[PDB]
Amino acid sequence: YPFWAQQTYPPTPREPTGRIVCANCHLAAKPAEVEVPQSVLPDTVFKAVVKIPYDTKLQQVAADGSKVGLNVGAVLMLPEGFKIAPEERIPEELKKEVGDVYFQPYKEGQDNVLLVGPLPGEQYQEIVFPVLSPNPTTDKNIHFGKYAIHLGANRGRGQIYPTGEKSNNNVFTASATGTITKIAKEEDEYGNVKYQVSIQTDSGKTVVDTIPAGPELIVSEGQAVKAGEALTNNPNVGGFGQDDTEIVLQDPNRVKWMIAFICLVMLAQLMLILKKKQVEKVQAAE
Amino acid sequence: MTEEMLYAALLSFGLIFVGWGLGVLLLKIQGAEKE
């Protein structure tokens, strides 16, 4: 889960390289988008979508396996200074009515750094982010230009646990270079129902292992030699992608001037054609 | 990463005619070529 990150590497989730802790555990392999406007203005509430693929057609296992509902989570680095829009503003509900969930910071304080407790599911695949823009004049500690924006979005069950041991959405391997002569699949009374196994490796010490409930299966005996490697089946569908970006804040009196400058060129490169040939009926006189 | 710039592509490329035209249009006014 998002939180999980700050429960181990809380100073920040973004690794020095460019990846977020998410994969140092719950590892997946799906797409992900995080697009927002080219330029946003200071002291302004604006958009920020976080699309999350996979056709809703999907339906993963669950904690107990029972093929069911799917869930979507994430994390995001907004630019230093950028915070979550103020209730009052958030111009009309036209905004409000899209993203209505809990956005908590990471380390206590970082408002530009936001996680999303609320994991809507096959509901909020847009996970919109109402975000306000800082004012770098009310605070000289805030500067302009482009600024980075990074994101690491998840989904599907974990493959690794914060406890420190294998999850469900994944595979359960083994250890034995020799044809496994049997099995051990069964069940349990109440909250449990295990599916053990019995390798062989008669080649010396006949070793075996313990695969749990969850993953389906495949073939059986007469072989299954190889070298005692992978398991029977893998359920994982975990989805974790990642997209980086950047947005610009613009000093209007800085866009004006640049524009006020055009019109000069706009006129200049004109009078410059105005004269010239547009007044050469001179040599075109003899 | 396509969409965004992708429109800026054909974007400009169009403007190439956008002006090119006028450039000429300003001609059917002061003595260029016919039509």
Binding site: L267, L270, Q278 | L15, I29, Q30
Partner: peptide, 27 residues
């Protein structure tokens, strides 16, 4: 989206000074 609702503007607006200027000396 509108954009042209602008090019058509600004753009032509300087054009609307261009064709005008000859009218001053040529005419």
């Amino acid at each position: 989206i509108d954009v042209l609702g602008w090019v058509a503007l600004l753009v032509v607006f300087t054009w609307s000074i261009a064709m005008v200027v000859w009218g001053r000396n040529g005419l």
